[PDB]
Design brief:
The structure holds three protein chains of three kinds. By secondary structure, chain A is mainly beta. Chain A folds into two domains: 1-111 and 164-190, no CATH class; 112-163, no CATH class. Chain A is built from four helices and twelve strands, in the order H-E-E-H-E-E-E-H-E-H-E-E-E-E-E-E. By secondary structure, chain B is mostly beta strands. In chain B, the strands form four sheets. In chain B, strands 2, 4, 5, 6, 9, 10 and 11 form a seven-stranded mixed beta sheet that branches. In chain B, strands 12, 13, 15, 16 and 17 form a five-stranded antiparallel beta sheet that branches. In chain B, strands 1-3-8-7 form a four-stranded antiparallel beta sheet, with no helix packed on it. By secondary structure, chain C is mainly beta. Chain C folds into two domains: 4-106, Immunoglobulin-like (Sandwich); 114-210, Immunoglobulins (Immunoglobulin-like, Sandwich), CATH 2.60.40.10. Chain C has helices spanning 122-126, 183-186; strands spanning 4-7, 10-13, 19-25, 33-38, 45-49, 53-54, 62-67, 70-75, 84-90, 97-98, 102-106, 114-118, 129-139, 145-150, 153-154, 159-163, 173-182, 191-197, 205-210. In chain C, the strands form four sheets. In chain C, strands 2, 4, 5, 6, 9, 10 and 11 form a seven-stranded mixed beta sheet that branches. A four-stranded antiparallel beta sheet of chain C has the order 1-3-8-7, with no helix packed on it. In chain C, strands 12-13-17-16 form a four-stranded antiparallel beta sheet. The longest helix of chain C is centred in the middle third of the chain and has 5 residues, at 122-126. In chain C, 37% of the residues are buried. Chains in contact: A-B, A-C, B-C. Chain B binds chain C through residues 35, 37, 44-47, 50, 58, 60-61, 94, 98-99, 102-103, 105-108, 122, 124-127, 129, 137, 139, 141, 143, 145, 166, 168-171, 173, 179-181, 183, 185, and chain C through 34, 36, 38, 42-46, 49, 55-56, 87, 89, 91-92, 94-101, 114, 116-121, 123-124, 127, 131, 133, 135, 137, 160-164, 174, 176, 178, 180. The complex binds 2-acetamido-2-deoxy-beta-D-glucopyranose. The site of 2-acetamido-2-deoxy-beta-D-glucopyranose has 6 residues of chain A, from helix 1. Chain A: It comes from Severe acute respiratory syndrome coronavirus 2 (2019-nCoV).
Chain lengths: 190, 216, 213
């Protein structure tokens, strides 16, 4: 069977700016075993979770990261916001599934979990499935920064600082995005 | 040092269009988050529009489909295009580098949405009293009557006199025209030797009036 | 939309007092809450960002605290320069929303107004209207009564007044009252009087003139 467990059950998830991709190949996938086993979000575009078990694809990608609850809505075709624009962008014609669950009991800490970051500053929007891991000081003026933070010179990433007492819109959510591409078709339902 | 200077505000009829401009110095507009905020006369602050570092735009529901936020990097300028204007759009509009980065706010530009016509004020002396107490204080002033729209500026002796000056908020008269008074207190012993002139400016009507105020 | 409610809507405090302005959000905004100071006749100035971070050029007598739905601005040692309207703002959840504002006045010792009356100009009269102006200069507190009297008949419905914002130089207010008559009504009467009642006056003060004297 396809190794979804390694994705969904990873101990640690990536920061959304540095989102992880697992390329799935040459295996059989029960996507109905997923679509009940427990998820606050399970939205499919251009496919149904039921119909996936009688379909074959060249490859499947499993993208995974953490964002805050109120940002899960940006993980959909046609959205704008700091997450869709600067961190993780789905194409308008997306074919796949967005799956999310509250991870407050795994990813929040007393005093703040500062390990999860997002890109706040960027001069232009990401292309679909673009990953920007630049740490370059953001030049907000005409004066070059020369790697030093100061006036008009900003670290481009910010921390969520997840705390267990946060309201649910500010709690961490683990997200997995399944993308299906159509060479010989190597990933099939049973 | 960062400067933000709004312009383009003025009197406009209901249904009309205006473009406000916010000329920036000291940061790159096209690289930054910026907003427009408005304040109706005597009211609080209302968010209007937002543009992200990378160009995504957001609007208050009350202006959605009517207003457009944009920027021109060659001119380092932020705009607000305002269509289908309504009386309730009447406000001072502020631009700001917000919510991220080194924060800065402009000084605001006044938009008046009204079908009433521009009218320049009449300026009348408030003459210092005859019985001004010999070694005491006299008051004198100017009455700036019957103008539309706001604002007027009053200076005394071309800005040489600032101490003891009060320029009152305008009252809206039942005529739909504004009126205000500007007064200053001076030593009574000054009245024989010092000239007092109020400089009134009403840009909307291109009125400038310099009224000399003397004992009658 | 996240509604922001500040408390109180106005306050009056003494020099050196520790002042508290509260802000409640109708839902959680975590730390993402700003404070602004708007001085009489200026634009809003950033005071605090993200609950507690002091902006450039703001003294450390200002501080912010709170989290989630409950926030506080504290001024530890109130100074006259702090006369302003203060606004909270939540910015991390669209639409950006502001509190309704807290107007801050500073107390001083009672100061009676200086009172002056001004007849209409001959120039205005020729044009068909008479504006009579009464000035109350540099008083505290703000509460004051102007009574216009024409040949000792108390006048109602034909006056408007205007009050300045509190001046940080001396913590005082001033007030303008304008009585408007037609030229024909103005010429029917002799004695034009404004009678002022204020806490700093043991009894009301009256300034008057006689038309054509
Ligand atoms: C992850 O872990 C649980 C509990 O051990 C297991 O039952 C579940 O099937 C796993 N999830 C996936 C999608 O493999």
């Amino acid at each position: 069977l396809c190794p979804f467990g390694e994705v969904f059950n990873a101990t640690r998830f990536a920061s959304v700016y540095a989102w992880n991709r697992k390329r799935i190949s040459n295996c059989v996938a029960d996507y109905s075993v997923l679509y009940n086993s427990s998820f606050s979000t399970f939205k499919c575009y251009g496919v149904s979770p039921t119909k996936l078990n009688d379909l074959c694809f060249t490859n499947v990608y499993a993208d995974s990261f953490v964002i805050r609850g109120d940002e899960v809505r940006q993980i959909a075709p046609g959205q704008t916001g700091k997450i869709a624009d600067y961190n993780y962008k789905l194409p308008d014609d997306f074919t796949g599934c967005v799956i999310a669950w509250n991870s407050n009991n795994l990813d929040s800490k007393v005093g703040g979990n500062y390990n999860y970051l997002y890109r706040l500053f960027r001069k232009s929007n990401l292309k679909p499935f673009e990953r920007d891991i630049s740490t370059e000081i953001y030049q907000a003026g005409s004066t070059p920064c020369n790697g030093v933070e100061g006036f008009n010179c900003y670290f481009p990433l910010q921390s969520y600082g997840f705390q267990p007492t946060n309201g649910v819109g500010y709690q961490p959510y683990r997200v997995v995005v399944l993308s299906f591409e159509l060479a010989p078709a190597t990933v099939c339902g049973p | 040092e960062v400067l933000l200077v709004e312009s383009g505000g003025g009197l406009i009829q209901p249904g009309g269009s205006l473009r406000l401009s916010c000329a920036a110095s000291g940061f790159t507009v096209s690289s930054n988050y910026m907003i427009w905020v408005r304040q109706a006369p005597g009211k609080g602050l209302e968010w209007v529009s937002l543009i992200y570092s990378g160009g995504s735009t957001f609007y208050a529901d009350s202006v959605k489909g009517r207003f457009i936020i944009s920027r021109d990097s060659s001119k380092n300028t932020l705009y607000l295009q305002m269509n289908s204007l309504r009386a309730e759009d009447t406000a001072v509009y502020y631009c700001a580098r917000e919510p991220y980065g080194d924060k800065a706010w402009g000084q605001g530009t006044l938009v008046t949405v009204s079908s009433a016509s521009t009218k320049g004020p009449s300026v009348f002396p408030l003459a210092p009293s005859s019985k001004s107490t010999s070694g005491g204080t006299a008051a004198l002033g100017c009455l700036v009557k019957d103008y539309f729209p706001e604002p007027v500026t009053v200076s005394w002796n071309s800005g040489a006199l600032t101490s003891g000056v009060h320029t009152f908020p305008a009252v809206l008269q039942s005529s739909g025209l504004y009126s205000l008074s500007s007064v200053v207190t001076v030593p009574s012993s000054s009245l024989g030797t010092q000239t007092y002139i109020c400089n009134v400016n009403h840009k909307p009507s291109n009125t400038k009036v310099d009224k000399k105020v003397e004992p009658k | 939309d996240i509604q922001m409610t500040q408390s109180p809507s106005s306050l009056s405090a003494s020099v050196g007092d520790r002042v508290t302005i509260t802000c409640q959000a109708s839902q959680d905004i975590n730390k993402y809450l700003n404070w602004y100071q708007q001085k009489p006749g200026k634009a809003p100035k950033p005071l605090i960002s993200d609950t507690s971070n002091l902006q450039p050029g703001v003294p450390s007598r200002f501080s912010g605290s709170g989290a989630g739905t409950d926030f506080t601005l504290t001024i530890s040692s109130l100074q006259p320069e702090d006369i302003a309207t203060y606004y909270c703002q939540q910015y991390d959840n669209l639409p950006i929303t502001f509190g309704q504002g807290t107007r801050l006045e500073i107390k001083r010792t009672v100061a009676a107004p200086s009172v002056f009356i001004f007849p209409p100009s001959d120039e205005q009269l020729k044009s068909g209207t008479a504006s009579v102006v009464c000035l109350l200069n540099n008083f505290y507190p703000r509460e004051a009564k102007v009574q216009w009297k024409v040949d000792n008949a108390l006048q109602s419905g034909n006056s408007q007044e205007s009050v300045t914002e509190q001046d940080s130089k001396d913590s005082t207010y001033s007030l303008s009252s304008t009585l408007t008559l037609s030229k024909a009504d103005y010429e029917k009467h002799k004695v034009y009087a404004c009678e002022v009642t204020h806490q700093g006056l043991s009894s009301p003060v009256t300034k008057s003139f006689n038309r054509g004297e």
